[PDB]
C-alpha cells in the first residue's frame, strides 16, 4: 500500500520540466530542481505519519534524492532519471502486554 | 447509552369502547420536557400509631404527556377509549400497561394531551442484571 | 391444527439447556474391567444413569461420580478420567467373623448368608471375606463398625503413576480437579501439572485440585508442601468414611457453590455442608484440639461432624511460604485463587481494546485525526479502570500512584534489545476485605 | 467536621410476598435536598394554659434516593419492607429497622422520594455526648 | 519540559445512543486559545451560618472546546451520543473521563464546538511525584 | 478544504395563508457572522452523580441573510414556511425542510436574522465518513 | 482459557518487588558452628526463615 | 499429523478469510477469536490441539 501510494503521489513529476546542476529556474517557467523535489517528497512523507509510516527516526537521513548524473559515472547517466532511497518503518501496533500481579493482604 | 434519564419510544393502542375497534400501536412523542411518571405498587399505605402501617387496595397509575396524533380523534385521549401504553426509557427499562383507562381528563389545546392512565398492574422490564 | 399454520413453529421438548454448560469438573480415579470406558481418556458423564456400564460396578470412580451427582443437581458439566490398576497391583483383603463406607452401604453361617444377600451390589469390596474391587493402597482405608470381628488380612500395594497429563488433557480448561487416590507421587504430579497451567509462558487454564491425606499427625505434615495449587484435606487415622467420597463431595460442593460466584468461602453449617456424606453419630471429632490447631496453621483443611453430615473448617490451600518470605497469606484462603482468576480474566478482557491500536512511543505525540495513543494515556485509562472496580475486585488502594506502572519494552530492555509494540504492566492489587474474626468481649 | 451532608445510605429490601432479602446496597442522593428525620417517637399538641396532651406517633423519615437499576421500582413504593441506615459527614448515624413506605407518590423512574415510617430511629452521637 | 500550560493530546470516543456504534478514539485540536477547563470534586458545597457548609451531591464537569472532525456527524458533538474523553497536558497531567454526556448543546457554526461534558468522576494522572 | 464559510444559501418560501411556493432563490450573506447550527433534536440537562435528563426538543438554525427585494419582508419574519439549504465551502450541506421562524426581530429592511426551527436537520458529510 | 490467547499473557506471582533493593544494611556478629555460612564472607539474607540454619 | 479435517479445506478457508477481511483494510492481523475464526470449518470436540507446547 505504501509503495502504490508513493507511486500515485510521484505522478506529478512525470513530464515536468527539471533543471539539473546547470542553473536555477528563471521567471515564468513551470519547472523544478532536485532540491525542491526532495523537499516536497520529504514533507509528504512527514504528513503521512500514523497511517503509512512510523513517527520517524531521523528524516534528514531516511529520504535521499539523487540525479542519475551523480550516481552513474561520467557520460553514463541519463537526463530525467532520479534515484530515490527511503527507509520505511511500519506503524507500531499493539502486542504482548505481560501483566504482572503481586497481590497482598 | 445508560446514565441518561428520558423516554425513547411511546406506543399507544386505542380500543374504542363503543365500536370495539382497535387502532395501533402508533408511536407518539413528548410535548415538553416533563417525563412520563409511574407508580407500580398496586397497594397504597397509611400512617398509623407506633410504627404500624395500614395497607389498602390501590392501582398502578401513570401520567403520560404526549402530542396527539392528527389521525386519531381527540376523544380517545380523554377517556372515550381504552389504551394499552408501552414506554421504553433510554436505560433499557420497558413499562408495559394493558387494559388502561383515562380517569381525570383535562381540557387540552388540541396538540398536547396529558393522560392519567390507570390499570391493575404495570410490568417492568428491568434491563439485564437483576437482584 | 389451526392457529399453528405458519408464522410460528412450536418445539416442545424438555431437554433444552438455555444457559449452556458452565464450571466443568474433572474426576480422576480407577475403573474396573467390568466397565466399557476407555482408560486414560477424558469422558463426559451426564446422568445418574448407567455409569456402572461404563466405569464398572463398585469402582472408586463410580462411587466418586455418584457422590458428585448427589451433591450437585445442576449447573455443572461433569468429566471423568478413568484409570487402570497397575500390573503388579495387589488387592487388599478383609475378613469378617454394621456400618461400612457411608450410610447407604450399611446393613453363624446363616448370619453370613443373609448378610451377603443384603450387601449393596455397588459396594467397592467383593463379599465373610471382603476383597478390594480395585488393586492398590486405596482399599486399605476401609472401616467396618457395628452400629463380629474385622481386622483385615491383606494390605494392598502398588498404585498407578500415569504422568500423561499433557497428552491426555492438553487444553480442555478445568475449574475443579478431584483425585481419588492417596498416592503422594500422583498428587505431586497433579500439583506439577496444575502449576504448569499457571505458567507465564503459556495461556493459562486456571484450575484447582482437591486431595486428601489420611494418617497420624506426624506423617500428614510430611506429605504437605508449600504449593497452593491443591487443597490438602487432613483426615484422621480413624476416619470412618471412604476418603475419596468425602474429597469428591467437597470438590463438587465447592465447584457448584462458586461457579459464577467466585468469592464465597466454603464454610458454615449452611454453605459448607456436605449433605451427601453421612457418618454415624460420635463425640470424638478425629483430630485433637492441638492437632486441629496445628493443621489449621500448616495449610490443611480440617473437617468435623455436625446419621450426621460432616462439616469443614479453614477452607484454605496449602500455601504457607513465599519464595523464601514467611509472611504470605495472599493465597492462604481458597477463595483467593478464584478472585485471582476472575481478576486476571477481567483485566485481559478490558485490555482487549488495544489490539491493533497505533501506539506513538517516546519520540512524539498523536497527530490530529489518527486513532493512535501513547503510554501515558493508556496508563491513565488503566488507572481509572482499576479505580472503578474498587469494592468488587480490589480493595480501596494503598497508593494507586505507586501500585500501577506501565513501561514500554524499549525502556526496560537494553539498547537494541527491545522490540516495538510490547508493553509491561506492573500492578499490585489487594483482595477486598470480607468478614473475619470479631473477637467479642462480653 | 463543620460540614452537613450524608456520606453513606444503606437500604435492605424485604419483599412481603416471597420474603426475599436484598442488600444492603449503597445509594445516591437525587438532588441537594438532604434526608429529614423525626426521631422522637411521640407527637405533642397544644392545650389551654401551658399543658400538652402527650400522644403516640411514628418515627418518620423522608428519604430521597436514586433507585438502583437492579431493583424493581415497586420496592421503593410500599411493596417491600425497608431497613435503612444512614451516616452523615459529621459521624452521626441513624439506624432504622422494619420500616415501611407510607405514601408512595408517583415517580418518574429514576429518583424516588420514600416516606418511611418506623417504630424508632437510633442515633450514634459521635464521640462526646451529654 | 514543565512550566508550560496547554494540552498536547485530546482523545474522544463516541458511542451512539440508539445504534450503539463505537467510534474512536480520535484525536482532536483546539479551536482557539482557550484551554479546556475542569472540575474534579464531585460535591458542590454551599455557605451556611458561622462557617458551616452543606455538602450536596453534584458532578465532575469538564468544559472542552474542540474542532469537530469532518468524518463524524455534528450531532455527535451536541448530545446525541456518549463521549469517553481523555486529555493530556504539556506538564504530564492526564484527565480520564468515561460515560460522559453533553448537557447544554450550544449552537455551533459547523467547525468549532464547545462541549459541556458531565460525568460521574474525573481521574487525574498527576505526573510523578505526589503528596 | 481548511476554509470555513458558506458558499450557497437557498431558501424556498411557502406562504401559510395562500399556499403559494416561491423558490428556491439563492441568497446573500449580510456580514461576517456565519450561520449557526444545532442538529441534536434532544436537549440535555445536568443532574447529580453524572446522570443527565434527556428531554425532547427541536433542531434550530440561526441564519442571517440579506433579504431579496422581490420577496415581501413578512416572509422572513414568520409569515411563511422556509425550506433552507446551506452548503459550506468544505462540501458539507445542511438541508432543512418545513421550517418556521420563532422569534422575529425588528429588522431595518435589508438584513434579517432568521431563527428557524425544524424537526431535524440533515448533514451531507463530504466523502469520507466514520 | 477464553480470550487469554495471545496479547495478554498473565504472569501472576506473589513475590515481585517492583522497586528493587534500596538502602542496603550490613549486620556483623559472632555465630556458632551449627551454621552453614562461610565465615568472614558477606552474604545477602533473603528472609527470616533460614537464619537459624 | 493427526489432523482430522481435509487440509485443503482449512487452507482455503484461511486464505479466503484473510483476503476477504483485509481487502481495503490492509492492516488487520488475522488473529484472535474475533478475527482469526474459521466459521465454515468444523471439528469434533477434542482436548488435544494436535501439536504440543514444544513443537508449537
Residue numbers in the entry:
A (entry chain U): 393 to 497
B (entry chain E), E (entry chain C): 3 to 133
C (entry chain T): 4 to 100, 113 to 122, 132 to 151, 158 to 177, 192 to 350, 358 to 493
D (entry chain B), F (entry chain F): 4 to 133
G (entry chain j): 4 to 56
H (entry chain U): 281 to 336
Authors' own words:
Milano is a contractile tail bacteriophage that infects the pathogenic plant bacterium Agrobacterium tumefaciens, an important tool that is widely used in genetic manipulations of plants. The contractile tail of Agrobacterium tumefaciens bacteriophage Milano is flexible and bent to varying degrees, which sets it apart from other contractile tail-like systems. A contractile sheath and rigid tube assembly is a widespread apparatus used by bacteriophages, tailocins, and the bacterial type VI secretion system to penetrate cell membranes. In this mechanism, contraction of an external sheath powers the motion of an inner tube through the membrane.
In the initial extended (pre-attachment) conformation, virtually all tails in cryo-EM images were bent, complicating the reconstruction procedure. The curved tail structure was reconstructed by dividing the tail into overlapping segments. Fragments with a common curvature were clustered using 3D variability analysis and used for reconstruction with no symmetry imposed. As a result, the surface of the tube displays substantial grooves at the interface of two rings that are not found in straight tubes of other CIS. In the curved tail, these grooves are smaller on the inner surface of the curve when compared to the straight state, showing that these grooves enable the bending. The backbone traces of the tube subunit in the baseplate-proximal straight region and in the curved middle region of the Milano tail structure are virtually identical with an RMSD value between their Cα atoms of ~0.5 Å which is at the level of experimental error. The curvature is therefore realized at the level of side chains, which adopt slightly different conformations in the grooves separating the subunits. The interactions of sheath and tube subunits in straight and curved tail segments are very similar, suggesting that these interactions do not constrain the bending. In the extended tail, these charges are neutralized by the sheath (specifically, by the SHD), and the tube-sheath assembly is flexible. The cryo-EM map shows that each sheath-subunit forms three different disulfide bonds with neighboring subunits, covalently linking all subunits together.
